Design a protein around this ligand. Structure first.
Ligand SMILES: [Mg+2]
Ligand SMILES: [Mg+2]
Lengths: 96, 80, 110, 154, 98, 126
RNA sequence: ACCUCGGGUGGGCACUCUAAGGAGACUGCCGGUGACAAACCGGAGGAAGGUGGGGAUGACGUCAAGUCAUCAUGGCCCUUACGGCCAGGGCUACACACGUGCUACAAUGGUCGGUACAAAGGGUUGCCAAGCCGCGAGGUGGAGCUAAUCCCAUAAAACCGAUCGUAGUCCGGAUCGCAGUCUGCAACUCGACUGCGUGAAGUCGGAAUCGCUAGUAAUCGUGAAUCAGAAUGUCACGGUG
C-alpha cells in the first residue's frame, strides 16, 4: 500500500484510520514505513518592472507513506476507501 | 551543418520555376524571396533576383558558386 | 633542408617534429607510430638511416612553403566572388560570426 | 568595537612531532592545497639534513630568531601631522612576522626545483646573509630616526 | 494584446490537427535502411504543408495573462500572476520555506 | 558480550566502528589502514584517541564508514571510536573531555543567499 | 547458515538511514564583582553556555523614486487604420569610451599511465541502458522504468609512477583554413559541439578601488529552472580548507 498527499496532518493521520480499521478485522498489518520526501524549490521574481535582487522562494512538499499487510483475507478496506480518502490523499494499492 | 544523411536542400516552388524555366532558356531574371536554398549544377549560369530585404538584386551564377547559398550574395546592412 | 626546415636538438622526437609546420601534435604521434621511431630518445641519439622514413611522411601531408600558398587561394576564392564570408574578409572584420560592436580587437589591433 | 575575538588552535604534526612547523605550514598553503604544501616543507626540510648534520628543526629554530624583529614603526597620525611611532612588538606577534617574511622572499628566489628556494632561505638565516635578515635590520634602522617621536605626540 | 492571443490560439489547432502524417514523414527519413527515392518524395510532402504545424512555431504563453516571458510548466501561470494566486491559499501544497 | 558499537559523524560522514578484544587488528571496509587513507597525516589521527588511552595493542577494530569526504571520514572515525571507548566506564571520561575529543564538530557548510554569489561574497560595485 | 563469494540468498529488526512524535539550555548551578539590582567577569557539568549557527519576519515614514509595456482604471487621441493578415530584413551593424565576468601569464606547475572518497536534483508525451559500429562528437539497438527498485551518472581537486628543466616554453589558447555529426520545414546574414592544421596578445598588470572575521575567504566539480536546439549568467548542493 502506498500513500501520497501534501501535508503530514492528513497522511500520517489517515494511516491510523487504516491500521486500526484493518487489524480489527483479524488480518495482521505491520507498522507503516516512511519514505524520502519530494522537495521542489521555486525561486520567483517579485517586482513587476525590474529590480532583480528582490526575490522570493517557495517549496512544495509531497509526503509518502507505505503500509504492509501480512495475511490478505479482508475486503473490508476495499469498501472503506471512500472513508479513508478524505481530501487530498491518494492511495495506490499494494496488498502484499 | 546539414549533415550528409539529408544531403541536398532546394525549395519546391523554386524548382518548378527553374527546371521548367530551363526548357525556355535565359530571357528573364528570376525574382524570388527565398534565401534558404543552395544553388545546384542544374542551375549554372542563371539570373536570380534575390530579395535584399527591401528590394531585389541580380545574381550572376557561375560554376564555382555551387556549395554556398544565396544568402552570401545579397546584402543586409550598409555601413557606408 | 634538414626535414624541410631546421629541427632543434636535445629534445624528444614528437616535440622536434612539431616545428615542421603542417604537422601538429596528434599527427606527429602517428608518424613515430607508423615508422617506429621512439619519441623517448632524443634526436641526437637517433640514426642517420631512418630519417628518410620521417622524410617520407613529410612528402605526404603538406609543406609550409606551399601550405601558405594554397590556403591563400582559399582566401582568394572567397574575396573575388564577393560572397559575404569574403566580403568582410577583404576589410578586416571577424568572419565566423563573433560580436563586432566591442572586443574584437585581435583583428583590428590596438 | 566590543571585544569579541576568542582563540582557535591548530597543533598537528604527526610525522615529525613538532608544533611550530605546523603553524609554519599554514603560511605556505594556497587555497587549501595542504597535501601539496606538506611535501614541500618536508621537501625543504630534508635538504637541510642533507646539507647540515644537525637536526633541521634547530636550523629552523635559529632561522626564526634572526628574521624576527624587536621594534617597529606605527603611523598614528595626530590629525594634522603624519607621525610614525616606534613600538615594541608584542611577543605573540613576533613569530608570524618572520614566517611571513620568509615565504615571500622564497617566491622571488628565482631558482628551479621550488623546495630548493625555501632550502636556501633557512640556510642563510643561521648566518645572517639572507634577504630576510637584510629586510629585518633595515626596519630596525628606521626606528632610531623615528625615536624622537617615541612618547611625545605619540 | 487580445488580437495576439487569438492568432496564437489557432496555431495550437493546426499543430494538433495534422500531427500524425509528420510523424510518418519523419519515420521514413530517420531509417538508415530507407531508400532515398522513398526519402526524396517524402521531402515533398513536408514543405507543401503549411509551416505552422511544427512544435517550434508553438510558443507556450501564460494561460490567464498572455505574457511570453516568465512561464513555468509545472503551472500554467506567469511569473507575476503566480504570486498573487499563491498568497490567497489557492495553489495546494505550496508554502514558503528555508 | 565484549563487542562495542561506536558511531561518529563529522562533515556529512558516518562511521560504524566496532570494538572488541584482539591484537592490533585494524581493518576498515575490508582494507588495511595504511592502504585506505592514501598519503596523509590522518593515518595517525585515527590513532590519537587510542594511544592517549593506552589501549593501542589490546583491541580488534572493525570500521565501516560511508559518505563524506576524504579527510572527513578520518574525523568521523576519531569521533566514532571515542564513543566506543566510553562504553566501559567514566575513568577515561576526564581523559577525553579535557582532550577535546568527545564533542561533535558542529561546523557545517552554509547555503548560497540571493544577491550574493558565495555564502558571503558579493559582487563588486563602484 | 547459505553461497557461484555479489546482502547473492535464506534470514535478522542490532544498526546506519528515513520521518513522525518527544525530552535538552533556563545565567540553571559554583565563586567573585554591582546599590547585591538589574547585570558583568570567571567555574563545574554537558552533544551544545550565555540571543548554539543559519533562514523567513523589515515599525511611523521618506525620495510626486520606478512601472499606463504584467494586469486594473480616470481622461485624451486613432477607428478605410496609430487597427488586422503574410512573406523576407532587423534587434546579434561598429574608429571608439565605461560597467560587471571568465580564463591565463606557469615548475605549490604541464602531460601520460594507473587508482580513492560526495551531496542534491530530474525522468511513462520522457530517461533512453547492455550489445554494437565510429579518430571523436555520435549512429544503431531496444531493455528497464512510473520510481529509496530502472536510467540520468563517469564527481573533480587529492594520492602513485613517469617524463617536462622555468624557454614566449611539451606556457597560453584568440584568430583562421579544411572536414564532420545533432536539432529543426529551414544553421547565408545568425546556433552548438567534433576532427585536423595554424598559432597571436599576454613574463602578475599606473593613479586609483572593492569583497570578507570561520567550515569564512580561496580553489575543484555536480544539478535544476527557462528549453526543438543554445550559459563564462541566475538559483542550488557538496569536496579540500
Ligand atoms: Mg567603534
Ligand atoms: Mg535546454
Amino acid at each position: 500500500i502506498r500513500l501520497k498527499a501534501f501535508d503530514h496532518r492528513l497522511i500520517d493521520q489517515s494511516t491510523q484510520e487504516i491500521v486500526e480499521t484493518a487489524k480489527r478485522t483479524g488480518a495482521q498489518v505491520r507498522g507503516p514505513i516512511p519514505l524520502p520526501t519530494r522537495k521542489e524549490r521555486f525561486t520567483v521574481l517579485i517586482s513587476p518592472h525590474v529590480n532583480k535582487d528582490a526575490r522570493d522562494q517557495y517549496e512544495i512538499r509531497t509526503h509518502k507513506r507505505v503500509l504492509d499487510i501480512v495475511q490478505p483475507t479482508d475486503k473490508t478496506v476495499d469498501a472503506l476507501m471512500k472513508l479513508d480518502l478524505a481530501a487530498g490523499v491518494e492511495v495506490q494499492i499494494s496488498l502484499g | 551543418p546539414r549533415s550528409l544523411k539529408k544531403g541536398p536542400f532546394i525549395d519546391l516552388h523554386l524548382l518548378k520555376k527553374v527546371e521548367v524555366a530551363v526548357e525556355k532558356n535565359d530571357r528573364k531574371p528570376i525574382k524570388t524571396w527565398s534565401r534558404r536554398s543552395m544553388i545546384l549544377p542544374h542551375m549554372v549560369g542563371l539570373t536570380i533576383a534575390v530579395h535584399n530585404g527591401r528590394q531585389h538584386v541580380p545574381v550572376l551564377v557561375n560554376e564555382d558558386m555551387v556549395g554556398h547559398k544565396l544568402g552570401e550574395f545579397a546584402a543586409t546592412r550598409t555601413y557606408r | 633542408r634538414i626535414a624541410g626546415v631546421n629541427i632543434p636538438d636535445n629534445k624528444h622526437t614528437v616535440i622536434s617534429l612539431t616545428y615542421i609546420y603542417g604537422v601538429g601534435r596528434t599527427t606527429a604521434q602517428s608518424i613515430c607510430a607508423a615508422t617506429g621511431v621512439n619519441p623517448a630518445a632524443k634526436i641526437k641519439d637517433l640514426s642517420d638511416e631512418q630519417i628518410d622514413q620521417l622524410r617520407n611522411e613529410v612528402a605526404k601531408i603538406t609543406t609550409e612553403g606551399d601550405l601558405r600558398r594554397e590556403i591563400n587561394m582559399n582566401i582568394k576564392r572567397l574575396m573575388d566572388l564577393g560572397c559575404y564570408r569574403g566580403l568582410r574578409h577583404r576589410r578586416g572584420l571577424p568572419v565566423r560570426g563573433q560580436r563586432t560592436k566591442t572586443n574584437a580587437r585581435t583583428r583590428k589591433g590596438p | 568595537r566590543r571585544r569579541v575575538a576568542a582563540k582557535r588552535e591548530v597543533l598537528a604534526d604527526p610525522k615529525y612531532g613538532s608544533q611550530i612547523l605546523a603553524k609554519f605550514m599554514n603560511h605556505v598553503m594556497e587555497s587549501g592545497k595542504k597535501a601539496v604544501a606538506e611535501r614541500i616543507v618536508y621537501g625543504a626540510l630534508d635538504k637541510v639534513k642533507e646539507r647540515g648534520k644537525a637536526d633541521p628543526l634547530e636550523t629552523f629554530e635559529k632561522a626564526l630568531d634572526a628574521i624576527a624583529p624587536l621594534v617597529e614603526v606605527k603611523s598614528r597620525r595626530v590629525g594634522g601631522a603624519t607621525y610614525q611611532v616606534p613600538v615594541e612588538v608584542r611577543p605573540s606577534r613576533r613569530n608570524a612576522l618572520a614566517m611571513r617574511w620568509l615565504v615571500d622572499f622564497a617566491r622571488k628566489r628565482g631558482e628551479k626545483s621550488m623546495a630548493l628556494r625555501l632550502a636556501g632561505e633557512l640556510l642563510d638565516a643561521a648566518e645572517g646573509k639572507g634577504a630576510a635578515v637584510k629586510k629585518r635590520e633595515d626596519v630596525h634602522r628606521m626606528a632610531e630616526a623615528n625615536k624622537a617621536f617615541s612618547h611625545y605626540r605619540f | 494584446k487580445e488580437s495576439m492571443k487569438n492568432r496564437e490560439l489557432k496555431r495550437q489547432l493546426t499543430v494538433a490537427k495534422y500531427a500524425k502524417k509528420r510523424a510518418e514523414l519523419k519515420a521514413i527519413i530517420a531509417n538508415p535502411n530507407s531508400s532515398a527515392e522513398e526519402r526524396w518524395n517524402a521531402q515533398v510532402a513536408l514543405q507543401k504543408q503549411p509551416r505552422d504545424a511544427s512544435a517550434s512555431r508553438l510558443r507556450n504563453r501564460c494561460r490567464l495573462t498572455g505574457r511570453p516571458h516568465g512561464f513555468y510548466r509545472k503551472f500554467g501561470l506567469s511569473r507575476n500572476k503566480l504570486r498573487e494566486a499563491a498568497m490567497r491559499g489557492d495553489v495546494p501544497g505550496l508554502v514558503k520555506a528555508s | 558480550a565484549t563487542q562495542n558499537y561506536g558511531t561518529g559523524r563529522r562533515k556529512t560522514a558516518t562511521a560504524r566502528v566496532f570494538l572488541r578484544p584482539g591484537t592490533g587488528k585494524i581493518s576498515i571496509n575490508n582494507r588495511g589502514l595504511d592502504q585506505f587513507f592514501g598519503r596523509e597525516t590522518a593515518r595517525m589521527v585515527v590513532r590519537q584517541p587510542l594511544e592517549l588511552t593506552e589501549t593501542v595493542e589490546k583491541f580488534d577494530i572493525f570500521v565501516t564508514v560511508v559518505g563524506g569526504g576524504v579527510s572527513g571520514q578520518a574525523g568521523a572515525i576519531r569521533h566514532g571510536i571515542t564513543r566506543a571507548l566510553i562504553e566501559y566506564d567514566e575513568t577515561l571520561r576526564s581523559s577525553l573531555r579535557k582532550a577535546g575529543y568527545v564533542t561533535r564538530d558542529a561546523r557545517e557548510v552554509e547555503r548560497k543567499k540571493v544577491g550574493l554569489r558565495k555564502a558571503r561574497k558579493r559582487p563588486q560595485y563602484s
